[PDB]
Symmetry: C5
Subunit: 312 residues, 5 copies
C-alpha cells in the first residue's frame, strides 16, 4: 500500500520481460498493430520476509490488492492496456514475482520508400514514474524475453524480438522517468508481386510500343490511347496493394515514368503523321526506325538509374 | 480458495468438453472467425464431500466464488473470452461439474492455394497453467464434445468437430503447461463459381481469338485491345471473390496465363500486318492459318498441365 | 434465491411475451439483424403470498435481487443480450410479473433465390434450462405479443409478428430444455428496381442488336465490343444492390444469359464477314435477315422459360 | 426510494428540457444520427422540505442514490443512453432540480424524394411509465430548451429546435405512458452540386448530340457509344453522393431520361444510315435536320414537366 | 467531499495544463481526430494543511476519493473521456497537485478551400461549472503546456501547441461557466501531389490537344472522346485523395475547367469538319490554326486568374 523505503538512499530496481504470444492487424496506412503478450516484473521488498521453517511453506501467494505494485505504463498506445493478473509469488528473502497477460494497440511509424523490399522495426516503449518517497528504475531480464513459435504476420517474416538493455532516464513534470525499448524486426515477402503487378503493366506498355511498326494513323492512335486506358484500369485494379504515403516510393516512380513514356509515344505518332502529310516520307521513316530502338533502351537505362538511386 | 492438496503426489485431472452452438464472421483475409459455445469442466475435490442421507439432498449447488476453480485460458484468441457461469454442482463423492457459455474471436491461419476447391481445418487451443502446490493436466470427455445442427457458415460445408485426446505438456517460464487441440473441418462450396467467374472470361478470350479469320489491321487491333480492356474491367468486377494472399493460387495463375495469351495475340497480329505490307501474303496466310489451330490447343495443354501441377 | 419447490411433482410454467419496439441493421450478406424490444415473464411462487388487508396494499414491489428469477437465454444471438429490469410486481396469490427492455443481434439465414420478389421469415428462439430440483417449461401469452406501429425496415414491408404456441422439449447435456420460436414475416419492395437495373441493361443489349442492319465489319465490331464494355461497366455500377450468395439467383441467370447472347452476336458478325469475303453475299444476307428475327424471339422465349422455372 | 404519495388523487408532473450541445454522424442510408445534450428534470416532493433558517442554508445537495428519481427513457434509440449526473438540488418548498449529460444514437426516417433541395425534421421521443402507486405525466419547460451556437452538421443548415408542448398519453401493457416529441429542422446545402454533378453530364450528352451534323456512319457510332461509356463511368464516379433509396427521386428520373435519350439517338443514327444505303438521301437529310431541332426541345420540355411534377 | 468555503467572497482558481503525448486518426470527412495526453490541475484548499515537522514528511498522498476534486469536462467531444488518476499530492500550505492520463475523440471543423496548400487550427475546449456554494474559474499554467517530440500526423507538419490565457465566462442554465481554448496548428505536406495528380491529367489534356494538327474527322473524334474517357478513369483512380466537401475548392475548379475545355475541343472539331464538308477549306484551316495558339494561352490565363482568386 506504500512504496518500500530504501536502506539509505538506493533506488528500487524492477526487472522486466515480455513474452510475445500473438500479433495481428498490422495497418500500413494507420501505422498501427495489435499485440497480446505476457508481462513479467520482479523487485525486492523486505517487508514481506518470512521464515520457511516456521511457516512450513517455501512460496507464498498474495492478492493483487493489499500489496504495493509499481505502476508500469506503455507510451505509444492508443488506450490503456487490458490486463488481468496471473500469479503473484514472494520468496523468503522478499523477492516478488509478478505475471500478467495484456492486450494493447501500438502506434509505430513505418517507412515504405522501398515498398516491395522494405524492412521495418516495430517499437514498444515501457515507462515508469518515480514517487516522492523513492526513485524507481527499470532493468531487462534476458531470460523472460521471447516469442512463441506460432507468431505470424500475413505477408511478413518475423526475424527477431530483442530489447535495449540500457534504459533512458529523464525528467518530466518535475519527476524522474525511466524508459525501455522493445524492438521487433520484420521483412516483407515480395513474391507474387512480380506476376500480379509488374508483368501485366509491362505487357500493356509493350503492346503500346507496337505502333512503331505501322504507318496507319488511325491504328496507331487507337493502339496508344486504348493502351493508356487499359493501364489506368489496371492501376485501379491493383491500387489496393500499393502503399498510400505522402512521399514518393519506388513503384510510384515507375508508374510516373510509364505515364511519361505514354505521352512521348503519342507525341512521336503525331510527329510521324504530320511529317508524312507534308510529303516527306524519308524523315518519318528515319524517325520511326530510330524510335524502334530508342524507346526500350531508354526505358532500361532509366529503370537501372532509378534502382541505383533508391537502393544505393 | 486454495488448490486441493494431493493424496501423496498425484496430479489433478480436469476433463474438458466443448459443445458448438454458433459460428460466424469467417474472414479469409484476416484469418479470423467468431465462436459461441459451451465449456464443460469436471474435477475431483474431496474437501466438498457430504452425506446425502444426513443432508437430505443428492446434489448441492455453489456460487462461482467461495470455491476453487481451475484457470483455463485460450491461446489463439484476440482478447479474453466473455463468459458467464451457468451451473456448478457437486456430488457426495466430491466431483464438481462446471458449465459456462462464452464468446470469443479465434486466430487460425488458412491455406487457399486451391481456392475454388480448398479444405480447411480450424484450430482452437486450450491451455492450463500449474500452480506451485499442485500440477494440473487436461483430459477430453468424448460425451461432452459436439455441435448443434443449426451451425452454418455461408459458402462452406461443416464436416466434423473432434478433439485430439492426447494433451501436449511443456514448460514455459519455469512452469508446466498442458494444451489441448480442438479441430473443425470445413469444405468450400464451389458451385456458382463457374457461371459467375470462369465462363465470361473464356467468352471474352474467345471473342478476342476471332481476329485470326480477318485480314483487316484496324479491325484486329480494335478487337484485341478492346477485349483486353473488357478483361481488365471484368477482373475489377469480380476481384471481391478472388483470394488476396501473398502466394500464388490456381485462379491467379490462370489469369496470368490469359494476360500472356493477349500479349502473344497482339504480337501475332502485328507480325501478320507487317508481312502483308512487305508484299509477302503467302507467309502471312500460313501464319494466321497455323495460329487458328495453335492457340486453343496450347491453351488446353497449358491448363491441363497447370491443373496437374496444383492438384497432383 | 432458490427455485420454488413443487406441490407434489408438477413442473413450473413461465408465460412469455415479446413486444417489438425497433428493428434495424438488416445485413443480407451476414444474415444478421438488430432488435430492441420488451420481455415479459410471469410465473407462480406461493412463498411470496401476503394478506392485502393486513399489509394495506394490493401490489408489492421487489428488487431484482433477493428474488428467484428463471434464467432465460436466447439461442441464435452473437452475444448475451444487454438488458435492464423495469418492473417486478407480486400479487397476493403469489403471481410474479417481470418486465425488462433488452437489445440483441440475431443470426437468421436468408434465402434470396428470387431476389427481386422474395419473402423472408426471421426467427428468434427462446430457451430455458431446468434445474436439478424443479423442471421448467415455457408458454406463450398471446396478449403480450405485438409490435409498435413505428417499426420500419428500409426496403421491406413488415407483415406480421406471431409466435408458435407449442414449445419444443428436448434433452441436452443430461438436462431438459424447452424452446419457443418467434417469427417475423417481411416482404421486399421491388419498385425502382426496373428503371434502375433492368431497363438500362436491355437498352444496351438492344443497341448491340443494331449490327444486324449493317454490312460494315468495322462498325459492327465496334458496336458489339463497345456494348460489351458498357454492359460490364453497368454491372460494376449496380453490383452494390445485387445479392452476393453462393447459389444461383434469377438476376444472375439473366446476366449470364446476356453474356451468352453477346458471345453469339460476335460469332454471327464474324460468320457474316467471312461469308462476304468468300464472294457469297446471298448466304450472308440470308443469315443476317434470319438473325434479325431469331435473336429477340429466342431472348423472349428463354426469359419466359427461366421465369417459369424459378417461380413455378 | 419510493414514489411520493399524492395529496388526494393528483398526478405527478415532471418538467423537461433538452439543451443541444453537439450533433454528428448523420447517416442517410441508415437513417441515424448521434446526439450529445443536457437533460433537465424538475418535480415536487414535499418529503424533502426543510427550514432555511434552522438549517442555515438555502439549497441542499443530494446523491443520485437515496433519492427517488423518475425513470425517463428514449423510444427511438438503438441502445440505452450513456449518461452521468451533474447536479441534484432541492428547494425548501421541496422542488427538486435534476441535470445530466448524455449521449445517444437516434433512429429517424428520412424522405429524399427531392434530393438536392430536400428539408428534414428529426424527431426525439421522450417517454415515462407510471407506477402502481402514482401516475406520472410530462411537461415542457420552454426556458430549458435550446441549442449551442457551435452546433453544425456537414452539408446542412440548422434552422430551429423546438418541442411539442402537448404530451401524448396512452396505455401499453396495462400501464399509462406519456410521450413528448422534440423536433430539429434542417435544410440541405445544394451548392457545388451543379458544377460537380449536373454540368459534366449535360456536356457529355451535348457531345453525343453532335452526330446530327455528320453523315459518316463510323464516326456517329463511335461518338454515341463512347459517350454512353463515358456517361456510365461518370455515374460510377459520382454515385457516392447520390441517394440510395428504394423509391424514385428527381436525380434518378433525370438519369433514366438521359439513358432513354441515348437509346433514341442510337436508333436515329441507325435509321439514317439504313435510309442512306437504300439510295434515298432526301429522307435521311430531312430526318437528321428534324432531329437537330427535335432533341433539345424535347429534352427541355421533359425536364420542365418533371420539375413541375416533383416540386408541384 | 464538499467544496472549500471561501475566506469572504473570493472565487476558487484552478490552474490547468495539457501535455500532448500522441495524436492519431485525423478524419477529414468526419472532421474528427483522436488525442492522448496528460491533464494537470492545481488549486488551494486550507482544510488539508499540516505541519511538516510534526508529521515528519513534506508531501502527503491521497486517494482519488475522500478528497474534493473539481469537475472538469470537455465540450467538443463525442463521449466522456476515458481517464485514470496518476498522482495526487498536497503541500503543507494546502496546495493540491492533480495529474491524470486520458484519451478522447474531438470534433473540430476544417476548411479545405485551398486543399493542396491549406493550414488548420484544431481546438480543444475545457469548461468547468460553478456550484451553489462557491464560484470556480480557470487559469493556464504555461509551464505545464507542451507536446512530446514523437508526436506525428501522417501527411501533416505540427507547428505549435499553445493556449489562450484568457478564459471565457458566461451563464448557462442559471449557472456560471468558464471556458479555456487549446489550439494546435498544422500544415499539409503538398509534395508528391504534383507527380501523382497534376501531371498525368495535364498529359491527357495535351494528348487531346493534338487533334489540331490533323484533318481526319475519325482520328480527331477518336482522340478527343477516348481522352475524355481516360480523364474520367483517372479521376476515379485519384478520387480517394481529393477532398469531399459541400463547397468548391481549388482542385475541383481546375477539374471543372478541364471538362469545359474538353467540350469546347469537341465543338471545334465538329465545326472544322462541317466547314470542310461545305467546300470551304480556307475557313477551316484558319480556324484550326487559330485554335492551335488559342487553347494553351486561354488555359494558362484562366489558371492564373483562378490561382489569384483563391490565394489572393
Ligand atoms: C521487350 C521489347 C518489346 C518491344 C515492343 C514490342 C515488339 C513486338 C514485336 C515487334 C513487331 C513484330 C515483328 C515485325 O514487325 O517484324 C516481322 C518480321 C519481318 O520479316 P522479314 O523482314 O522477312 O525478317 O518477321 C519475322 O520473322 C520477325 C520475327 C517475328 C517474331 C518477333 C519476336 C517476338 C517479339 C519479341 C519481343 C517481345 C518479348
Ligand atoms: C472454343 C474455341 C473458340 C475459338 C475462337 C472463336 C471462333 C469463332 C468461330 C470461328 C470463326 C467463324 C467461322 C468462319 O469464319 O467460318 C465461316 C464458314 C465458312 O463457310 P465455308 O468456307 O463455305 O465452309 O461458315 C460456316 O458455315 C462455318 C460454321 C459457322 C459456325 C461455326 C461454329 C460456331 C463457333 C464454335 C466455336 C465456339 C464454341
Ligand atoms: C479453366 C477451367 C478451370 C475450371 C474447371 C472446373 C470444373 C471442375 C468440376 C469438378 C471439380 C471437382 O470435383 O473438384 C473436387 C476436387 C478436390 O480437390 P482434391 O481432391 O483435394 O485435389 O478438385 C479437383 O480435383 C480439381 C479439378 C478441377 C481442375 C481441373 C480442370 C482442368 C480443366 C482444363 C480444361 C478446361 C480449359 C478450357
Ligand atoms: C425491342 C427490340 C429491339 C430490336 C433491336 C433494335 C432495333 C432498332 C431499330 C431497327 C433498325 C432501324 C430501322 C431500319 O433499319 O429500318 C429503316 C426503315 C426502312 O425504310 P423502308 O425500307 O422504306 O421501309 O425505315 C423506316 O421507316 C422504319 C421505321 C423506323 C423506326 C423503327 C422503330 C423504332 C425501333 C423499335 C424497336 C425498339 C423498341
Ligand atoms: C427480363 C425482365 C424481368 C423483370 C420483369 C418485371 C415485371 C414484374 C412485375 C410484377 C412482379 C410481381 O407481381 O411479382 C410478384 C410475384 C411474387 O412471387 P411469388 O408469387 O412468391 O412466386 O413475383 C412473380 O410472380 C414474378 C413475376 C416476374 C417475373 C416474370 C416476368 C417474365 C418477363 C419476360 C419477358 C420480358 C423479357 C424482355
Ligand atoms: C445546348 C445545345 C447543344 C446542342 C448539341 C451540340 C451542338 C454543337 C454545335 C453545333 C454543330 C457545330 C456547328 C455547325 O456544324 O455549323 C457550322 C457553321 C456553318 O457555317 P455556315 O453554313 O457558313 O453558317 O459554322 C458557323 O459559323 C456556325 C457557328 C459555330 C459555333 C456554334 C455555336 C457553339 C455551340 C453552341 C451550342 C452549345 C452551347
Ligand atoms: C436539369 C437541371 C436541373 C437542375 C436545376 C438547378 C437550378 C436550380 C436553382 C434554384 C433551386 C432552388 O431555389 O431550390 C429551392 C426550392 C426548394 O424546394 P421547395 O420550395 O420545398 O419545393 O427548389 C425548387 O423549387 C426546385 C427548383 C429546381 C428544379 C427546377 C429546374 C428545372 C430546369 C429545367 C431546364 C434545364 C434543363 C437543361
Ligand atoms: C504544353 C503544350 C502542349 C500543346 C499540345 C500538344 C502539342 C504536341 C506537339 C505538336 C504537334 C507535333 C508537331 C508537328 O505537328 O509539327 C511537326 C514539325 C513540322 O516540320 P516542318 O514543317 O519542316 O518544321 O516537325 C518538327 O520538326 C517540329 C518539332 C517536333 C517536336 C515538337 C516539340 C515536342 C512537343 C512540345 C510540346 C509539349 C511539351
Ligand atoms: C495547374 C497547376 C497548379 C499546381 C501548381 C503547383 C506549383 C506550386 C508550388 C509552390 C506552392 C507553394 O509554395 O505553396 C505555398 C502557398 C501557401 O498558401 P498561402 O501563402 O497561405 O496562400 O501556396 C500558394 O501560394 C499557392 C501557389 C500555387 C498555385 C498557383 C500556381 C499557378 C500556376 C498556373 C500555371 C500552370 C498551369 C499549367
Ligand atoms: Cl498501459
Ligand atoms: Cl480466454
Ligand atoms: Cl441472452
Ligand atoms: Cl434511454
Ligand atoms: Cl470529458
Amino acid at each position: 500500500v506504500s512504496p518500500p523505503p530504501p536502506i539509505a538512499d538506493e533506488p528500487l530496481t524492477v526487472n522486466t520481460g515480455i513474452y510475445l504470444i500473438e500479433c495481428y492487424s498490422l495497418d500500413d496506412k494507420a501505422e498501427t498493430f495489435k499485440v497480446n503478450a505476457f508481462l513479467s516484473l520482479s523487485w525486492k521488498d523486505r517487508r514481506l520476509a518470512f521464515d520457511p521453517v516456521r511457516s512450513g511453506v517455501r512460496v507464498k501467494t498474495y492478492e493483487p490488492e493489499a500489496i504495493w505494485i509499481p505502476e508500469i505504463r506503455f507510451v505509444n498506445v492508443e488506450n490503456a492496456r487490458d490486463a488481468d493478473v496471473v500469479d503473484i509469488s514472494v520468496s523468503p528473502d522478499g523477492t516478488v514475482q509478478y505475471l500478467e497477460r495484456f492486450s494493447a494497440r501500438v502506434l509505430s511509424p513505418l517507412d515504405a520508400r522501398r515498398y516491395p523490399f522494405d524492412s521495418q522495426t516495430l517499437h514498444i516503449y515501457l515507462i515508469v514514474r518515480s514517487v516522492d518517497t523513492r526513485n524507481i528504475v527499470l532493468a531487462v531480464d534476458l531470460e523472460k524475453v521471447g516469442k512463441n513459435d506460432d507468431v505470424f504476420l500475413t505477408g511478413w517474416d518475423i526475424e527477431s524480438f530483442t530489447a535495449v538493455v540500457k534504459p533512458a532516464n529523464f525528467a518530466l513534470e518535475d519527476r524522474l522517468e525511466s524508459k525501455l525499448d522493445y524492438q521487433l524486426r520484420i521483412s516483407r515477402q515480395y513474391f507474387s508481386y512480380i506476376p500480379n503487378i509488374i508483368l501485366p503493366m509491362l505487357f500493356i506498355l509493350f503492346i503500346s510500343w507496337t505502333a512503331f511498326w505501322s504507318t496507319s494513323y488511325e491504328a496507331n492512335v487507337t493502339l496508344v490511347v486504348s493502351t493508356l486506358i487499359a493501364h489506368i484500369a489496371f492501376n485501379i485494379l491493383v491500387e489496393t496493394n500499393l502503399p498510400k504515403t505522402p512521399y514518393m516510393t519506388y513503384t510510384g516512380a515507375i508508374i510516373f515514368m510509364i505515364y511519361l513514356f505514354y505521352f512521348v509515344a503519342v507525341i512521336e505518332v503525331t510527329v510521324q503523321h504530320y511529317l508524312k502529310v507534308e510529303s516527306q516520307p524519308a524523315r518519318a521513316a528515319s524517325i520511326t526506325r530510330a524510335s524502334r530502338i530508342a524507346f526500350p533502351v531508354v526505358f532500361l537505362l532509366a529503370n537501372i538509374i532509378l534502382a541505383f538511386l533508391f537502393f544505393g
